[PDB]
Amino acid sequence: SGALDVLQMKEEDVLKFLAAGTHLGGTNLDFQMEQYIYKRKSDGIYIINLKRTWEKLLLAARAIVAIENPADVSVISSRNTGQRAVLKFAAATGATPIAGRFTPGTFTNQIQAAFREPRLLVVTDPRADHQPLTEASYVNLPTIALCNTDSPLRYVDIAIPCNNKGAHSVGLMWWMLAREVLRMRGTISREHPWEVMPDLYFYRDPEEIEKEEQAA
Amino acid sequence: EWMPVTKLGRLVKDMKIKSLEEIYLFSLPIKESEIIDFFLGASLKDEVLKIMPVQKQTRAGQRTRFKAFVAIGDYNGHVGLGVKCSKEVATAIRGAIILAKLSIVPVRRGYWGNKIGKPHTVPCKVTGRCGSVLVRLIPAPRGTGIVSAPVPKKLLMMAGIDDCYTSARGCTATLGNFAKATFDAISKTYSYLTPDLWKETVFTKSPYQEFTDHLVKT
Amino acid sequence: GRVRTKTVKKAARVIIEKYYTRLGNDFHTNKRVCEEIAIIPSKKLRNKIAGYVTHLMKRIQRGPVLQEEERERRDNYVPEVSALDQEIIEVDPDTKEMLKLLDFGSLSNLQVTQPT
Amino acid sequence: VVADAGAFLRHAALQDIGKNIYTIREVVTEIRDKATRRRLAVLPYELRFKEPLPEYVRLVTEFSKKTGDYPSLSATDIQVLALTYQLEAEFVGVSHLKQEPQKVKVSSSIQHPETPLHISGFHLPGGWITPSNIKQIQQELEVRVGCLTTDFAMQNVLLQMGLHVLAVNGMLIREARSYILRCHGCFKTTSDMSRVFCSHCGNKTLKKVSVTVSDDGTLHMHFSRNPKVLNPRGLRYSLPTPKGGKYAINPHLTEDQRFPQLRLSQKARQKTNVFAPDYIAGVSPFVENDISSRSATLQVRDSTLGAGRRRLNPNASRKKFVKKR
Amino acid sequence: MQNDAGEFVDLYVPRKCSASNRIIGAKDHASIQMNVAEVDKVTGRFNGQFKTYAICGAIRRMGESDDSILRLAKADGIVSKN
RNA sequence: GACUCUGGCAUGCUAUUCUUAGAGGGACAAGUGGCGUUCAG
Ligand SMILES: [Zn+2]
């Protein structure tokens, strides 16, 4: 946000952030992430400032939009909570998704079936996805990372302070990132709400799949 | 026939990238030897610094492989240093040549006294360190020549440095650390910041960013 | 003579196992849905793929030689009501203080819960 | 008399007690116990299988997510609940049951959640464990239809909605005393006591809260008014860089991060059983330890071993010559 | 760099770091040249211009690349104050 | 030569039906009848 009244955080976004629990960070704290916290509460939980989260999300969306080829953005998730969302993010944008195992040597070993050369890297979790951070360090790739309070900031350029442990928070962050990228490009109107609701981006958890197929 | 794998190799194969310095401008990794083969070509000469035969240990036994230390160099321009251990000596030599082609770095050249003509010497006194081996390069007046041990003389002659005073420290008997320390000193010649390079850098568009429309089709 | 290439074989097996539903019997419809589906370099490879898949859909629909559609049906599930749209949401007093400092103090869905 | 899998695990032969025995296939076929499948082919066959209706499983889920138990429930659990719902609706009149249940009432105490109350062998100031009582200690033991559920969530939802359920004891139960885990960041309650990360926000923040549900349908839960429970002492510490590979162990910050597979060998995880009929023929009184395997050299340990070591705060001082794994 | 006659006697001029003013090396493969988009001030849609920041590999190693990019974004008006 | 590239026809786009040279189409055994382990051919 360049102090633009269009790009400010609205009431519905704040309600979504409170509903998922993005303000509820981790319990540990990395010293480089202390700039993005609000206060330490009594029982130990670190509160994530939502305005800084909005500003870093806008910075990340601006970085993604500035990549001309939409396939040059690589979006990787290793753990389950981000997986579907990453695939859904591809359906929003066209960026190249890696869900599941990230094979080492993807960005460095040129003679491979899964060798690919991106231009911008977007990472669900810097703690879980350390290997693509190392490869991006080797092959000159800037990094977007959805960082929590206890998240190392080695080889990341834009750290988005948010809760990334819960499935709802991860899905919400990916959905608002996709919505902001599509609004920034201009393919969807900023005034009307997006027709894709954020519940499309959440983890399925097959026992809950059984419970939901039961109630049909 | 060369069939490139990387996007950089695809651009080098076509006429999108005209010079090697552009690839050195954005510090992109050169992962193919054919890029250096295409840009420099016949101007690259090779000089095998050393062949050491060594006995590889295996449960089958002590079997011999040869280790090649090769310094490749484009005169008044570039050097590369390659180390390769292999079964046959020719295979080790060509592997070291390939690994030295992948490590081609530019060297900055300056003047000792007043700036007349082409640069001939190292711009400022620099240092390269490798395993207790210290190599120090000092600017020299024109016409002096390289005053060094034979291996750094080889490297500085292939760098196009016409003249340079040298001082070494440590166990210089081992050739690998000595050559790598000289190579590191050559890299820090250009990595050094001087009052000449004080202008704010205007950012030219990246080669992947400029020719992304051509790279959509491939 | 003429023989089919192995890359065409594996790509057509992928197309058959992935999206057999939208594929049909006409050559040009199969070709256009094939160029719609996958990442595709060349025209001649596309046409070889289309011809081979058309011939093998002439084959397999006479006789043999479901999980992925159910998987993608589970993948694009959309609820009638968003789970984020809750009537009353719990809020911390410190989180409420942060919201007041960030100027969103006029919310209606928040309920402040004290640590008992 | 709807039999849940908890009665089958406990060898509850209450087939003579009831007559309307109704069970699900997926509450009996998933059991990996050999003795249960052995006695299943021996037990008299008067139990019968019945399927619930989609409307009734829909309604059961509809008020179960208003009770706040829906993440704790399972699919076959909902099958059992709605089967009992359909049976009591089709036999007995439906006016007995009430929907949209009562609110919670909060009454905290000074007692710790780790106070050892309601343990049979434990006694403060007489409570003895007699062989006349070893058959008696099951739970808080207090006409035609009922349930044989052992999970607290099933009892909770069935008693909030209003069905009289029972236990391995023949008499119907009256009160439900248990513990739940509550997040103190998001205030979401889970009936699964085994888990350590909450389902909503995912932090390592679940804490124990005691719950008592009366036979009326009124629930009251006790918090602990103790500063030791909500204390941020051993929580912030410097973390190592994340290591990869086959051997790296991570500090376990999320519930579903991919750990490398580091299992124990079969000889390393054999525990000696002493009441076997052929134990006395053993040359050694004990199962021999495993030192030969690669897992022994890597110091691979069980998940149970080293539990109080994790409870120490990392910002402390250990013994000089000891190393924490 | 430039001789007395006036010719630029140098192979190429290297880029410098946007935060710590250090020269990016030829094989500094952790170095980053990132483009951040500019938008119209009335609609918030992508304009076509972008601001470019270069970060050396050492700052990316130290974890200070995020703070440096944020500081440059506040300086260039991309990120609002507070 | 079961390797790589590629032509015939464009009244289509580009500075354009007669000359140009970049791109985009068009051809893939595609369809028909027989011989065929009824599938490879
Ligand atoms: Zn929680």
In this complex, the chains that touch C, judged by 3 or more CB pairs closer than 8 A, are A, D
Start-to-end CA distance of chain D, whole Å, equals 51
The CA-to-CA distance between both ends of chain A, in Å, stands at 43
Distance from CA of E26 to the nearest CA of B (A): 5
Question: Does residue A6 fall inside a structural domain?
Answer: no
> DSSP secondary structure string, D81-104?
HHHHHHHHHHHS-GGG---S-PPP
Residue A196 Cα to ligand 1 middle (Å): 26
**Ligand 1 centre distance from Cα of residue A43 (Å):** 13
Chain A neighbors (3+ CB pairs < 8 Å):
B, C, D, E
Q: Number of Cβ pairs closer than 8 Å across A and B?
A: 24
- Cβ-contact E33, E54 below 8 angstroms: yes
- Residue D116's CB is within 10 A of a number of other CB atoms, namely 10
Instruction: Give the tokens for residue D25.
Output: 């296939």
Distance A190 CA to F36 C1' (A): 65
Q: At residue B42, what are phi and psi to the nearest 5 degrees?
A: -75, -10
Are the beta carbons of C90 and D186 separated by less than 8 Å? yes
Nearest to B203 by CA among E34, D99, D13: E34
Rounded Cα distance between B59 and D111, Å, is 67
**Is A130 in contact with D200 (Cβ distance < 8 A)?**
no
Residue D186 annotated as part of some ligand binding site: yes
Which bases of chain F are contacted by protein, using any atom under 7 A from a CB? Answer: 2-5, 24-31, 39-41
Distance CA C11, CA B64 (A): 46
> What is the distance in angstroms measured between the alpha-carbon CA of D1 and the sugar C1' of F12?
79
- Which residue, D239, D209, D238, D205, is CA-closest to D222? D209
Q: Which residues touch strand F (CB under 7 A)?
A: B 217; C 1-5, 27, 31, 42-44, 47-48, 50-52, 54-55, 58-59, 62-63, 65
Pick from A176, D229, A164, A18: which is nearest to C95 by CA?
A18
Angle, in degrees to the nearest 10, between helices A80-93 and A167-185: 10
Which residue carries 């084959």 as its tokens?
C59
Is B197 in CB contact (< 8 Å) with chain E? yes
Q: How far is C64 from chain A (nearest CA, A)?
A: 31
CA distance to B55, B82, B88, B171, per residue, from B95 (Å) = 19, 8, 11, 27
Angle at D151 between CA D145 and CA D153, to 5 degrees: 90
Q: Name the residue closest to the C1' of F1 by its CA.
A: C1
Do chains D and E have 3 or more beta-carbon pairs under 8 angstroms? no
The resolution in angstroms reads 3.3
Task: With residue D48 as reference, give the H or E element that holds it.
Answer: strand D48-49
Range(s) of the domain holding residue A96: 13-216
What residue type is assigned to position D50 of the chain? K
- Candidate from A30, A42, A169 with C-beta closest to D201: A169
Alpha helix positions (H), chain E = 57-62, 65-75
User: What's the token pair of residue B183?
Assistant: 């190579």
Helical residues (DSSP H) of C4-42, grouped into ranges: 6-19, 27-37
- Distance separating alpha carbons of residues D253 and A148, to the nearest angstrom: 11
According to the annotation, is D183 in a ligand binding site?
A: yes
Contacts (Cβ under 8 Å, ≥6 apart) of D35:
D11
Provide the β-strand partners of residue D179: D210
- Dist. CA A49–CA A149, nearest whole Å: 11
Contact with chain A for residue B205, Cβ under 8 A:
no
From which experimental method does this structure derive?
A: cryo-EM
CB atoms near residue B172 (< 10 Å): 17
Contact with chain C for residue D186, Cβ under 8 A: yes
**Helix boundaries (H) for B115-174:** 150-158
Residue B41, phi-psi category: left (phi > 0), alpha (psi -120 to 50), beta (remainder): left
- Specify which residue's alpha carbon is closest to the C1' of nucleotide F24: C43
Residue A5 lies in a domain: no
Q: What's the number of CA atoms in the CB half-sphere (13 Å) around residue B39? A: 24
How many whole angstroms separate alpha carbon D72 and alpha carbon D178?
A: 15
Contact list in A for residue C102 (CB cut-off 8 A) is 49-51
Chain A residue closest in CA terms to E42: A6
A 10 A CB-CB count for A130 gives 22
First to last CA, chain B: 18
Report if residue A124 sits inside a domain.
yes
- From residue B171, how far is each of A179, B131, B187, D212 by CA, in Å? 62, 9, 21, 79
* Beta-carbon contacts of residue B111 (< 8 Å; ≥ 6 apart): B119, B120, B121, B123, B139, E3
CB A170 within 8 A of CB A122: no
What's the gap in Å between D68 CA and the centre of ligand 1? 14
Q: The domain spanning residue C4 has which CATH number? A: 1.10.60.20
Cα-Cα end-to-end distance for chain C: 85
Which nucleotide has the least CA–C1' distance to C65? F39
Planar angle of CA D267, D268, D274, nearest 5 degrees: 70
In this structure, the number of other CB atoms found within 10 A of the CB of residue D181 comes to: 20
Q: Residue D192 carries which DSSP code?
A: -
Q: Give residues after which chain D gaps, C-N over 2.5 angstroms.
A: 125, 142
A4 in a structural domain: no
Angle, vertex CA E40, rays to CA E36 and CA E46, nearest 5: 50
Number of domains in chain A: 1
**3-state secondary structure (DSSP) of residue A147:** strand
* Chain E CB contacts of B209 below 8 Å: 35
Q: b/e string for D16-33 if b means 16 or more Cβ within 10 A?
A: eebeebbbbeebbeeeee
